[PDB]
Amino acid sequence: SITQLFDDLCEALLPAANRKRAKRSLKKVAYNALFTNLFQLPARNKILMLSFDLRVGGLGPKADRLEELVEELEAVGSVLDLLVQLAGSGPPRDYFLNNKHVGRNVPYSGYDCDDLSVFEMDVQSLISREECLCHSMIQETLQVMEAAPGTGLPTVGL
Amino acid sequence: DDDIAALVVDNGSGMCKAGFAGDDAPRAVFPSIVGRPRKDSYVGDEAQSKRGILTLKYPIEHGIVTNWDDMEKIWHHTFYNELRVAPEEHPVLLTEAPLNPKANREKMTQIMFETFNTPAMYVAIQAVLSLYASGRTTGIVMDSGDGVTHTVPIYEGYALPHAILRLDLAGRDLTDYLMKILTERGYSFTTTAEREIVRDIKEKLCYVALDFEQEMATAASSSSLEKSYELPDGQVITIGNERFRCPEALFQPSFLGMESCGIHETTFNSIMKCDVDIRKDLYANTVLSGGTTMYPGIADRMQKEITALAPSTMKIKIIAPPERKYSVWIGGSILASLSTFQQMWISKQEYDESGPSIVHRKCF
Amino acid sequence: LIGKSINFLHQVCHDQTPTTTDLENAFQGKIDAAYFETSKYL
Amino acid sequence: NLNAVRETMDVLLEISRILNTGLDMETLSICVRLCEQGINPEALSSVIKELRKATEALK
């Protein structure tokens, strides 16, 4: 049944490691929220409206790819209608932009200093991310090395 | 628990289903036969096996309650054998066929408070409850089970009763028509047990034709519906042509000799008497339901007739459940879990203070 | 007395079927009710 | 058609990743099978978020 697929939704989104009483309560949670909206423009236009904010935030080829896929999926209508409603709450070189050394009859524009400077920032975000890992690995363990003994272990409860 | 557990007793036409809410499958399934001498207090298999000094009697045989003493008896055996629970710590949701009358409801709460002694209660329409299990609360529902049939339009979370169409079709009519055709085609047969077995064969093994014309031509050229069945006792029943005429009677209803509309005519007249402004909103989720899913091939004929029914300017969007045999039980179990459903749930206090008739007002 | 009935059903009938302040006196409530179900079911 | 609905299932994955939806492959398969029945997806958007809240309520 359709109400059985809602149990499988509870099965994927909660893995097992009790664990036989939580799933019926989550099944109740799955049923109780579905019918409040039911008591109380095309589809691809919203895709364009979301590609616009991408282009506002830079990052050209991602918008060019998002528009590329809906153009060939119209060349399943109800499932992308779910993705526009689930947007923004989940988990998320190249030498042909500012390197003019490769190509065939490369475009003549004089030189560059104004995107070559945002070609170091492309690496600077990575350099700022891989130091935040080591800030969050020294912190989780200095939270263990410094404490009054046995307040992170339940061994005092034995 | 943190509040007392809800209970559901579903008094169905063919079998009775009791259990606790918090589960999708029922706790106990008994037959609805009540043995009365030709035991003397036992409702179920033992009454059915001792039916040689006990005469036949059913509390619900039409699909609704047509014997109140008998229903109080199966309700009493429900309380003692099927439950033996503390009744004042268990609010109970009953379920009957679509559109309970007011006086029937008054009799229902009247005996529910004495034979059972419920602390709070609920009484419910069937097809809406079954729709709530299919994942919507608007739509048009053709509920044809082992009891009575209705094509219920429902929009705004409760059914529109001006266009609700009651249709006399039941499992009673099915077993009687099976006896008629099985003795009519030519065979030595009058006994009740093979009537039940061949009824199970028609329920599961028999083919519901997608159309009349195509299956007519296929069987007329060389009968492709032919199938043999080999029981433990050594029953031999075969021909495709008898299996082709057995469920044929709902395609054109005058094939049997009954006068009430067929499936396409009832659903067309039901969707016609429901308003045009909500017609397309209702037609965006039309549902299949009822116990007749014991063989999943009546759904094919249904969705072909529904796409033939409505104009081509709005196409079919029919939800076909991959299960609807336990539809009424799961309807109750999904409904009673909600917190907002508790506000329509009536207590014993109001039932004493303003008469029994308020159970028609608060619960509806 | 109730463990002499359930075991009896389990052993010679060969049926493994379903049979269905202080410490605040838990026992008296459950023992009697369990008897009133179980002994009748046998 | 069985050729086509595997490829459309594969292209359907990328636009669920780049739209930053919570779905991975398994939940995408559950949701495509659930929408195939005929349910309105704007309703499904709320039950998925309520499950993901009450899952964190345990841990």
Coordinates of C-alpha atoms in Angstrom, one line a residue:
Chain A
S1 CA 0.0 0.0 0.0
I2 CA 0.8 3.7 -0.2
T3 CA 0.8 3.9 3.6
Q4 CA 3.5 1.1 3.5
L5 CA 5.9 3.2 1.4
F6 CA 5.7 5.7 4.3
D7 CA 7.1 3.0 6.5
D8 CA 10.0 2.5 4.1
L9 CA 10.6 6.3 4.2
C10 CA 11.0 5.9 8.0
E11 CA 13.3 3.0 7.4
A12 CA 15.8 4.8 5.1
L13 CA 15.9 8.0 7.2
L14 CA 16.4 6.2 10.5
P15 CA 19.2 3.5 10.5
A16 CA 19.4 0.7 13.1
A17 CA 22.1 0.4 15.7
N18 CA 15.6 -0.2 21.7
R19 CA 15.0 0.3 18.0
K20 CA 11.5 -1.2 17.7
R21 CA 9.5 1.5 19.4
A22 CA 10.9 4.6 17.6
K23 CA 9.8 3.5 14.2
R24 CA 6.1 3.3 15.0
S25 CA 6.3 6.8 16.6
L26 CA 8.0 8.1 13.4
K27 CA 5.3 6.4 11.4
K28 CA 2.8 8.4 13.4
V29 CA 4.9 11.5 12.6
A30 CA 4.8 10.6 8.9
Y31 CA 1.0 10.3 9.0
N32 CA 0.1 13.3 11.2
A33 CA 1.8 16.0 9.0
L34 CA 0.5 14.8 5.6
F35 CA -3.2 15.9 5.9
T36 CA -2.9 19.4 7.3
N37 CA -2.2 20.9 3.9
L38 CA -4.9 18.7 2.3
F39 CA -7.6 20.1 4.6
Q40 CA -6.4 23.7 4.0
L41 CA 2.6 28.9 -13.6
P42 CA 4.6 26.1 -15.2
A43 CA 7.2 23.8 -13.6
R44 CA 10.3 24.8 -15.5
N45 CA 9.8 28.5 -14.8
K46 CA 10.7 28.0 -11.1
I47 CA 13.9 26.3 -12.4
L48 CA 14.8 29.5 -14.3
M49 CA 14.0 31.6 -11.2
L50 CA 16.4 29.5 -9.2
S51 CA 19.1 29.5 -11.9
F52 CA 19.0 33.3 -11.7
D53 CA 20.2 33.5 -8.1
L54 CA 23.0 31.1 -9.1
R55 CA 24.1 33.5 -11.8
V56 CA 23.8 36.4 -9.3
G57 CA 26.2 34.6 -7.0
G58 CA 28.6 33.9 -9.9
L59 CA 29.2 30.2 -10.8
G60 CA 28.1 30.3 -14.5
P61 CA 28.5 26.7 -15.7
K62 CA 26.3 25.3 -12.8
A63 CA 23.4 27.4 -14.0
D64 CA 24.3 26.5 -17.6
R65 CA 24.1 22.8 -16.6
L66 CA 20.8 23.1 -14.6
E67 CA 19.2 24.7 -17.6
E68 CA 20.8 22.0 -19.8
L69 CA 19.1 19.1 -18.1
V70 CA 15.5 20.3 -17.9
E71 CA 15.8 21.2 -21.6
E72 CA 16.4 17.6 -22.5
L73 CA 14.1 16.1 -19.9
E74 CA 11.3 18.0 -21.7
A75 CA 12.7 17.1 -25.1
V76 CA 8.6 12.5 -13.6
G77 CA 7.0 15.9 -13.7
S78 CA 5.8 15.4 -10.2
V79 CA 9.1 14.4 -8.8
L80 CA 11.0 17.6 -9.7
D81 CA 8.0 19.4 -8.2
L82 CA 9.3 17.8 -4.9
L83 CA 12.9 18.9 -5.4
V84 CA 12.0 22.6 -5.7
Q85 CA 10.3 22.2 -2.4
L86 CA 13.2 20.3 -0.7
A87 CA 15.8 22.8 -2.0
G88 CA 18.4 24.3 0.4
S89 CA 18.0 22.0 3.4
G90 CA 20.2 19.0 2.5
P91 CA 23.9 18.3 2.1
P92 CA 25.5 19.8 -0.9
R93 CA 42.4 22.2 -12.6
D94 CA 41.0 24.0 -15.6
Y95 CA 43.3 26.0 -17.9
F96 CA 40.8 27.5 -20.4
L97 CA 39.6 30.5 -18.4
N98 CA 42.6 32.5 -17.3
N99 CA 45.3 30.4 -18.8
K100 CA 45.8 31.5 -22.4
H101 CA 48.7 29.0 -23.0
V102 CA 46.4 26.3 -24.3
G103 CA 43.8 26.3 -27.1
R104 CA 43.8 26.8 -30.8
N105 CA 44.0 30.5 -31.9
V106 CA 43.3 31.7 -28.4
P107 CA 41.2 34.8 -28.0
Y108 CA 43.0 38.1 -28.0
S109 CA 42.0 40.5 -25.2
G110 CA 45.4 41.8 -24.1
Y111 CA 46.2 40.4 -20.6
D112 CA 44.4 39.5 -17.4
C113 CA 44.9 40.5 -13.8
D114 CA 41.2 40.7 -12.7
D115 CA 40.2 37.0 -12.9
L116 CA 43.7 35.7 -12.3
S117 CA 43.3 37.2 -8.8
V118 CA 40.1 35.2 -8.3
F119 CA 42.0 32.2 -9.5
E120 CA 43.9 32.2 -6.3
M121 CA 40.7 32.5 -4.3
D122 CA 39.6 29.2 -6.0
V123 CA 42.4 27.6 -4.0
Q124 CA 42.1 29.9 -1.0
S125 CA 38.7 28.5 -0.1
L126 CA 40.3 25.0 -0.1
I127 CA 43.2 26.2 2.0
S128 CA 40.6 27.8 4.4
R129 CA 38.6 24.6 4.6
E130 CA 41.4 22.1 5.2
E131 CA 42.6 24.1 8.2
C132 CA 39.0 24.2 9.7
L133 CA 39.2 20.3 9.8
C134 CA 42.3 20.5 11.9
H135 CA 40.6 23.1 14.1
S136 CA 37.7 20.7 14.6
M137 CA 40.0 17.7 15.3
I138 CA 42.0 19.5 18.0
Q139 CA 38.8 20.8 19.6
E140 CA 37.0 17.4 19.9
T141 CA 40.0 15.9 21.7
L142 CA 40.9 18.8 23.9
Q143 CA 37.3 18.4 25.1
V144 CA 38.5 15.0 26.3
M145 CA 42.0 15.7 27.6
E146 CA 40.7 18.5 29.7
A147 CA 37.7 17.8 32.0
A148 CA 37.1 16.5 35.4
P149 CA 37.6 12.7 35.1
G150 CA 34.9 10.5 33.6
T151 CA 32.3 13.1 32.6
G152 CA 32.5 12.0 28.9
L153 CA 32.6 8.3 29.7
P154 CA 29.8 6.4 31.4
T155 CA 32.4 4.2 33.2
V156 CA 31.8 6.2 36.4
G157 CA 28.2 4.8 36.0
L158 CA 29.6 1.3 36.3
Chain B
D1 CA 1.1 4.4 27.9
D2 CA 1.5 8.2 28.3
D3 CA -2.2 8.2 27.5
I4 CA -4.5 5.1 27.2
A5 CA -4.2 3.1 24.0
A6 CA -6.9 3.5 21.4
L7 CA -8.6 0.3 20.3
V8 CA -10.3 -0.5 16.9
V9 CA -13.0 -3.1 16.3
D10 CA -14.0 -3.3 12.7
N11 CA -17.3 -5.2 12.3
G12 CA -17.1 -6.3 8.7
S13 CA -19.6 -8.3 6.7
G14 CA -17.5 -11.4 6.0
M15 CA -15.2 -11.4 9.0
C16 CA -14.7 -9.4 12.2
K17 CA -11.4 -7.7 12.7
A18 CA -10.4 -6.5 16.2
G19 CA -7.1 -5.2 17.5
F20 CA -5.2 -2.3 19.0
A21 CA -4.2 0.9 17.3
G22 CA -0.5 1.1 17.0
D23 CA -0.4 -1.7 14.5
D24 CA -1.1 -2.0 10.8
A25 CA -2.3 -5.7 10.9
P26 CA -5.2 -6.8 13.1
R27 CA -4.6 -8.7 16.4
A28 CA -7.4 -11.2 15.7
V29 CA -9.5 -12.2 12.7
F30 CA -12.6 -14.4 13.3
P31 CA -15.6 -15.1 11.1
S32 CA -18.7 -13.1 11.8
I33 CA -21.0 -16.2 12.1
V34 CA -22.9 -16.4 15.4
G35 CA -24.1 -19.8 16.3
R36 CA -27.6 -20.2 17.6
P37 CA -29.1 -23.7 18.3
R38 CA -31.4 -25.2 15.7
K39 CA -22.1 -23.6 21.1
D40 CA -24.6 -21.4 22.7
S41 CA -22.2 -18.6 23.7
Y42 CA -19.3 -18.6 21.3
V43 CA -18.9 -16.5 18.1
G44 CA -16.5 -17.7 15.5
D45 CA -15.0 -21.0 14.1
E46 CA -16.5 -23.2 16.8
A47 CA -20.0 -22.1 16.0
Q48 CA -19.3 -22.6 12.3
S49 CA -18.0 -26.2 12.9
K50 CA -20.9 -27.0 15.2
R51 CA -23.5 -25.9 12.6
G52 CA -25.3 -29.2 12.6
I53 CA -27.3 -28.6 15.8
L54 CA -26.9 -24.8 15.4
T55 CA -28.9 -23.0 12.7
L56 CA -27.3 -20.3 10.5
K57 CA -27.5 -16.7 11.7
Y58 CA -25.4 -13.6 10.8
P59 CA -25.4 -10.3 12.7
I60 CA -24.1 -8.3 9.7
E61 CA -25.0 -10.1 6.5
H62 CA -26.1 -7.2 4.2
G63 CA -23.0 -5.1 4.9
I64 CA -24.8 -3.3 7.6
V65 CA -26.4 -4.3 10.9
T66 CA -29.8 -5.9 10.2
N67 CA -30.0 -7.8 13.5
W68 CA -29.3 -5.9 16.7
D69 CA -29.6 -8.7 19.3
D70 CA -27.1 -10.7 17.1
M71 CA -24.7 -7.7 17.0
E72 CA -24.8 -7.3 20.7
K73 CA -23.9 -11.0 21.0
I74 CA -20.9 -10.7 18.7
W75 CA -20.0 -7.5 20.5
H76 CA -20.1 -9.4 23.8
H77 CA -18.0 -12.2 22.5
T78 CA -15.6 -9.6 21.1
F79 CA -15.3 -8.2 24.6
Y80 CA -14.6 -11.5 26.3
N81 CA -12.8 -13.8 23.9
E82 CA -11.2 -11.4 21.4
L83 CA -10.2 -8.8 24.0
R84 CA -10.9 -9.6 27.7
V85 CA -9.3 -6.2 28.3
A86 CA -10.2 -3.4 30.8
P87 CA -12.8 -1.6 28.8
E88 CA -12.7 1.7 30.7
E89 CA -9.0 2.1 29.8
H90 CA -9.7 1.7 26.0
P91 CA -11.5 4.2 23.8
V92 CA -12.9 2.3 20.8
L93 CA -13.4 3.3 17.2
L94 CA -16.2 1.4 15.4
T95 CA -16.5 1.3 11.7
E96 CA -19.6 0.7 9.6
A97 CA -20.5 0.9 5.9
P98 CA -20.7 4.5 4.3
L99 CA -23.3 6.8 5.9
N100 CA -24.5 5.6 9.3
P101 CA -28.1 6.8 10.0
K102 CA -28.8 8.8 13.2
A103 CA -31.1 6.2 14.8
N104 CA -28.7 3.4 14.0
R105 CA -25.9 5.6 15.6
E106 CA -28.1 6.1 18.7
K107 CA -28.7 2.4 19.1
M108 CA -25.0 1.8 18.5
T109 CA -23.7 4.1 21.3
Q110 CA -26.6 2.9 23.5
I111 CA -25.3 -0.7 23.5
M112 CA -21.6 0.3 23.2
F113 CA -22.0 1.9 26.6
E114 CA -23.7 -1.1 28.3
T115 CA -22.3 -4.3 26.8
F116 CA -18.8 -2.9 26.5
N117 CA -18.8 0.2 28.9
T118 CA -16.4 2.4 26.7
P119 CA -14.9 5.6 28.3
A120 CA -14.9 7.5 25.0
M121 CA -15.8 6.4 21.5
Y122 CA -15.8 7.1 17.8
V123 CA -18.1 5.9 15.0
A124 CA -17.0 6.4 11.4
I125 CA -17.9 6.3 7.7
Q126 CA -16.0 3.6 5.8
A127 CA -15.0 5.0 2.4
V128 CA -13.5 8.2 3.8
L129 CA -11.6 6.1 6.3
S130 CA -10.3 3.9 3.5
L131 CA -9.4 6.9 1.4
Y132 CA -7.3 8.3 4.4
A133 CA -5.2 5.2 4.1
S134 CA -4.6 5.7 0.4
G135 CA -2.9 9.0 1.3
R136 CA -5.4 11.7 0.4
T137 CA -8.5 13.3 1.9
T138 CA -10.2 14.2 -1.3
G139 CA -11.4 12.0 -4.1
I140 CA -14.1 9.7 -5.4
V141 CA -14.1 6.2 -3.9
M142 CA -15.8 3.1 -5.4
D143 CA -15.9 0.9 -2.3
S144 CA -17.2 -2.6 -3.2
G145 CA -16.4 -5.1 -0.6
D146 CA -18.0 -8.2 0.8
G147 CA -21.0 -6.1 1.9
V148 CA -22.7 -3.1 0.4
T149 CA -21.3 -0.9 -2.3
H150 CA -21.1 2.9 -2.6
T151 CA -19.5 5.4 -5.0
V152 CA -18.8 8.1 -2.5
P153 CA -17.6 11.5 -3.7
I154 CA -15.7 13.2 -0.8
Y155 CA -14.3 16.7 -0.9
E156 CA -13.5 19.1 2.1
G157 CA -12.4 16.3 4.4
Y158 CA -15.9 14.9 4.8
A159 CA -18.2 13.3 2.2
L160 CA -20.7 15.3 0.1
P161 CA -23.9 13.3 0.8
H162 CA -26.1 14.8 -1.9
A163 CA -24.3 12.9 -4.6
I164 CA -23.5 9.8 -2.6
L165 CA -24.8 6.8 -4.6
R166 CA -25.8 3.6 -2.7
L167 CA -25.6 0.6 -5.0
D168 CA -26.9 -2.9 -4.1
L169 CA -23.9 -5.1 -4.8
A170 CA -22.4 -7.5 -2.3
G171 CA -20.5 -10.7 -1.8
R172 CA -24.0 -12.2 -0.9
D173 CA -25.1 -11.4 -4.5
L174 CA -21.8 -12.9 -5.8
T175 CA -22.1 -16.3 -4.0
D176 CA -25.8 -16.5 -5.0
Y177 CA -25.0 -15.7 -8.7
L178 CA -22.2 -18.3 -8.5
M179 CA -24.6 -21.0 -7.4
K180 CA -27.0 -19.8 -10.2
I181 CA -24.4 -20.1 -13.0
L182 CA -22.7 -23.2 -11.7
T183 CA -26.1 -25.1 -11.6
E184 CA -27.2 -23.5 -14.8
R185 CA -24.3 -24.5 -17.0
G186 CA -24.9 -28.1 -16.0
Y187 CA -23.2 -29.9 -13.1
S188 CA -24.3 -31.9 -10.0
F189 CA -23.9 -29.4 -7.2
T190 CA -26.0 -28.1 -4.3
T191 CA -23.7 -28.3 -1.2
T192 CA -22.5 -25.4 0.8
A193 CA -18.8 -26.3 1.3
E194 CA -17.8 -26.5 -2.4
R195 CA -19.9 -23.3 -2.9
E196 CA -17.4 -21.6 -0.5
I197 CA -14.4 -23.2 -2.3
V198 CA -15.6 -22.3 -5.8
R199 CA -16.4 -18.8 -4.5
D200 CA -12.8 -18.5 -3.3
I201 CA -11.7 -19.7 -6.8
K202 CA -13.8 -17.0 -8.4
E203 CA -12.4 -14.4 -6.0
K204 CA -8.7 -15.3 -6.6
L205 CA -8.3 -17.3 -9.8
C206 CA -11.1 -16.0 -12.1
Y207 CA -10.2 -13.3 -14.6
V208 CA -12.0 -9.9 -14.7
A209 CA -12.0 -9.1 -18.4
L210 CA -10.6 -5.7 -19.5
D211 CA -13.3 -5.4 -22.1
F212 CA -16.1 -7.6 -23.4
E213 CA -15.2 -7.6 -27.1
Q214 CA -11.5 -8.6 -27.0
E215 CA -11.9 -11.4 -24.5
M216 CA -15.0 -12.6 -26.4
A217 CA -13.0 -12.9 -29.6
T218 CA -10.0 -14.5 -27.9
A219 CA -12.1 -17.2 -26.2
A220 CA -14.2 -17.7 -29.4
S221 CA -11.2 -18.4 -31.6
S222 CA -9.6 -20.9 -29.0
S223 CA -10.4 -20.7 -25.3
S224 CA -7.3 -19.2 -23.7
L225 CA -8.9 -18.7 -20.2
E226 CA -9.0 -22.5 -19.6
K227 CA -7.3 -23.6 -16.4
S228 CA -7.4 -26.7 -14.3
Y229 CA -7.5 -26.7 -10.5
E230 CA -6.4 -29.7 -8.4
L231 CA -7.5 -29.7 -4.7
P232 CA -6.3 -31.8 -1.8
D233 CA -9.6 -33.6 -2.0
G234 CA -9.3 -34.0 -5.7
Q235 CA -11.7 -31.4 -7.0
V236 CA -11.8 -31.0 -10.8
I237 CA -13.3 -27.8 -12.0
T238 CA -12.5 -26.5 -15.5
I239 CA -13.6 -24.5 -18.5
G240 CA -12.6 -21.0 -19.5
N241 CA -16.0 -20.2 -20.8
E242 CA -17.7 -20.5 -17.4
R243 CA -14.9 -18.4 -15.9
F244 CA -15.6 -15.7 -18.6
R245 CA -19.3 -15.3 -17.8
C246 CA -18.9 -15.3 -14.0
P247 CA -17.6 -11.7 -13.4
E248 CA -19.1 -10.5 -16.6
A249 CA -22.3 -9.2 -14.8
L250 CA -20.8 -5.8 -13.8
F251 CA -19.9 -4.8 -17.3
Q252 CA -23.6 -4.7 -18.2
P253 CA -25.8 -5.2 -15.1
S254 CA -28.9 -6.7 -16.8
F255 CA -26.7 -9.8 -17.6
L256 CA -27.6 -11.2 -14.2
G257 CA -31.2 -9.9 -14.0
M258 CA -30.6 -7.3 -11.3
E259 CA -31.7 -3.7 -11.7
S260 CA -29.1 -1.3 -10.4
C261 CA -26.3 0.5 -12.3
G262 CA -23.0 -1.1 -13.4
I263 CA -19.6 0.2 -12.5
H264 CA -19.1 2.7 -15.3
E265 CA -22.7 4.0 -15.0
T266 CA -22.6 4.4 -11.2
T267 CA -19.3 6.2 -11.2
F268 CA -20.4 8.4 -14.1
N269 CA -23.7 9.4 -12.4
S270 CA -21.9 9.9 -9.1
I271 CA -19.2 12.2 -10.6
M272 CA -22.0 14.0 -12.6
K273 CA -24.1 14.8 -9.5
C274 CA -21.0 16.2 -7.8
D275 CA -20.3 19.9 -8.7
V276 CA -18.4 20.9 -11.8
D277 CA -16.2 23.4 -10.0
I278 CA -14.8 20.6 -7.7
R279 CA -15.2 17.9 -10.3
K280 CA -11.7 18.2 -11.8
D281 CA -10.2 18.7 -8.3
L282 CA -11.9 15.5 -7.3
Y283 CA -10.8 13.7 -10.4
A284 CA -7.1 14.4 -9.8
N285 CA -7.2 11.7 -7.2
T286 CA -9.8 9.0 -7.9
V287 CA -9.3 5.8 -5.9
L288 CA -9.9 2.1 -6.2
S289 CA -10.9 0.3 -3.0
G290 CA -12.8 -2.7 -1.6
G291 CA -12.3 -6.3 -0.9
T292 CA -12.5 -7.3 -4.6
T293 CA -8.7 -6.8 -4.9
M294 CA -8.4 -10.5 -3.9
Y295 CA -7.6 -10.9 -7.6
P296 CA -5.8 -7.8 -8.9
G297 CA -7.4 -7.6 -12.3
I298 CA -10.6 -5.7 -11.7
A299 CA -8.3 -2.6 -11.4
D300 CA -7.4 -2.8 -15.1
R301 CA -11.1 -2.7 -16.2
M302 CA -11.6 0.1 -13.7
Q303 CA -8.8 2.4 -15.0
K304 CA -9.8 1.7 -18.6
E305 CA -13.4 2.7 -18.0
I306 CA -12.3 5.8 -16.0
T307 CA -10.1 7.0 -18.8
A308 CA -13.0 6.4 -21.2
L309 CA -15.3 8.3 -18.8
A310 CA -13.9 11.8 -18.4
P311 CA -13.1 14.1 -21.4
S312 CA -9.7 14.3 -22.9
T313 CA -9.1 17.9 -21.7
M314 CA -8.2 16.6 -18.2
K315 CA -6.5 13.2 -18.2
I316 CA -6.8 10.4 -15.7
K317 CA -4.9 10.6 -12.5
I318 CA -6.0 7.5 -10.7
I319 CA -4.3 6.1 -7.6
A320 CA -4.3 2.3 -7.7
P321 CA -3.2 0.9 -4.3
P322 CA -0.7 -2.0 -4.4
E323 CA -2.8 -3.2 -1.5
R324 CA -6.4 -2.5 -0.6
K325 CA -7.7 -5.7 1.0
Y326 CA -7.1 -4.6 4.6
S327 CA -8.4 -1.1 3.6
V328 CA -11.0 -0.5 6.3
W329 CA -8.7 -1.7 9.1
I330 CA -5.8 0.4 8.0
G331 CA -8.2 3.3 7.6
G332 CA -9.2 3.1 11.3
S333 CA -5.5 2.6 12.4
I334 CA -4.2 5.6 10.5
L335 CA -7.1 7.8 11.5
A336 CA -7.0 7.2 15.3
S337 CA -3.3 8.1 15.6
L338 CA -3.8 11.8 14.9
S339 CA -4.0 14.4 17.7
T340 CA -6.6 16.5 15.9
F341 CA -8.9 13.5 15.5
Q342 CA -9.2 13.4 19.3
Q343 CA -11.4 16.6 19.2
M344 CA -14.2 14.8 17.3
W345 CA -13.8 11.9 19.8
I346 CA -16.8 12.0 22.1
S347 CA -16.6 11.1 25.8
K348 CA -19.2 9.4 28.1
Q349 CA -20.0 12.6 29.9
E350 CA -21.7 14.4 27.0
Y351 CA -23.5 11.2 26.1
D352 CA -25.1 11.2 29.6
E353 CA -25.7 15.0 29.8
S354 CA -27.5 15.8 26.5
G355 CA -28.9 12.4 25.6
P356 CA -27.5 9.8 23.1
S357 CA -28.4 12.1 20.1
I358 CA -25.2 14.3 20.6
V359 CA -23.1 11.4 19.2
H360 CA -24.7 12.3 15.9
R361 CA -23.6 16.0 16.4
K362 CA -20.1 15.9 17.8
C363 CA -19.0 12.7 15.9
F364 CA -20.2 12.8 12.2
Chain C
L1 CA -0.8 -23.3 39.7
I2 CA -0.8 -21.2 36.5
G3 CA 2.7 -22.6 35.6
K4 CA 1.2 -26.1 35.9
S5 CA -1.3 -25.3 33.2
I6 CA 0.8 -23.5 30.5
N7 CA 3.5 -26.2 30.8
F8 CA 0.8 -28.8 30.6
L9 CA -0.5 -27.4 27.3
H10 CA 3.0 -27.2 26.1
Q11 CA 4.1 -30.7 27.0
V12 CA 1.5 -33.4 26.6
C13 CA -0.9 -31.6 24.2
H14 CA 2.3 -30.6 22.3
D15 CA 0.8 -27.2 21.5
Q16 CA 3.2 -24.3 21.3
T17 CA 0.3 -22.0 20.6
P18 CA -0.3 -18.4 21.7
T19 CA -2.2 -18.5 25.0
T20 CA -3.8 -15.2 24.2
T21 CA 5.4 1.9 50.8
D22 CA 6.9 -1.3 49.6
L23 CA 7.3 -2.7 46.1
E24 CA 3.7 -1.3 45.6
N25 CA 2.1 -4.8 45.2
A26 CA 2.6 -5.4 41.5
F27 CA 1.8 -9.2 41.8
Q28 CA -1.9 -9.2 42.8
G29 CA -3.1 -7.2 39.8
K30 CA -1.4 -9.3 37.1
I31 CA -1.6 -12.8 38.6
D32 CA -5.4 -12.9 38.8
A33 CA -6.0 -11.4 35.4
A34 CA -3.5 -13.7 33.7
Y35 CA -5.3 -16.7 35.4
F36 CA -8.7 -15.5 34.2
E37 CA -7.5 -15.5 30.7
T38 CA -5.1 -18.4 30.6
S39 CA -7.0 -21.2 32.5
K40 CA -10.1 -20.6 30.4
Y41 CA -8.1 -20.6 27.1
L42 CA -6.8 -24.1 28.0
Chain D
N1 CA 10.5 1.8 -22.1
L2 CA 12.7 -0.1 -19.6
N3 CA 15.7 1.4 -21.4
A4 CA 14.3 4.9 -21.1
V5 CA 13.3 4.8 -17.4
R6 CA 16.7 3.8 -16.2
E7 CA 18.3 6.7 -18.1
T8 CA 15.6 9.1 -16.9
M9 CA 16.3 7.8 -13.4
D10 CA 20.0 8.6 -13.8
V11 CA 19.4 12.2 -15.1
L12 CA 16.8 12.7 -12.3
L13 CA 19.6 12.2 -9.8
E14 CA 21.7 15.1 -10.8
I15 CA 18.9 17.7 -10.6
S16 CA 18.1 16.4 -7.1
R17 CA 21.8 16.9 -6.1
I18 CA 22.3 20.4 -7.5
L19 CA 19.0 21.7 -6.2
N20 CA 20.4 20.8 -2.7
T21 CA 17.6 18.5 -1.7
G22 CA 18.1 16.0 1.2
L23 CA 17.6 13.1 -1.2
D24 CA 20.2 10.5 -1.9
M25 CA 19.8 7.5 -4.3
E26 CA 17.7 5.4 -2.0
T27 CA 15.3 8.1 -0.9
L28 CA 15.1 9.2 -4.5
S29 CA 13.9 5.7 -5.5
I30 CA 11.3 5.8 -2.6
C31 CA 10.1 9.2 -3.6
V32 CA 9.8 8.4 -7.4
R33 CA 7.8 5.3 -6.5
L34 CA 5.7 7.3 -4.1
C35 CA 4.8 10.0 -6.6
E36 CA 4.0 7.3 -9.2
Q37 CA 0.8 6.5 -7.2
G38 CA -0.5 10.0 -7.7
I39 CA 0.2 11.9 -4.4
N40 CA 0.7 15.7 -4.5
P41 CA 4.4 16.4 -3.9
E42 CA 3.9 19.6 -2.0
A43 CA 2.4 17.5 0.7
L44 CA 5.4 15.1 0.7
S45 CA 7.7 18.0 1.3
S46 CA 6.4 18.4 4.8
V47 CA 6.4 14.8 6.0
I48 CA 10.0 14.3 4.9
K49 CA 11.1 17.4 7.0
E50 CA 9.0 16.2 10.0
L51 CA 10.7 12.8 9.9
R52 CA 14.1 14.5 9.7
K53 CA 13.2 16.6 12.8
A54 CA 11.8 13.7 14.9
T55 CA 14.8 11.6 14.0
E56 CA 17.1 14.2 15.6
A57 CA 14.7 14.2 18.6
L58 CA 16.0 10.7 19.5
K59 CA 19.7 11.4 19.2

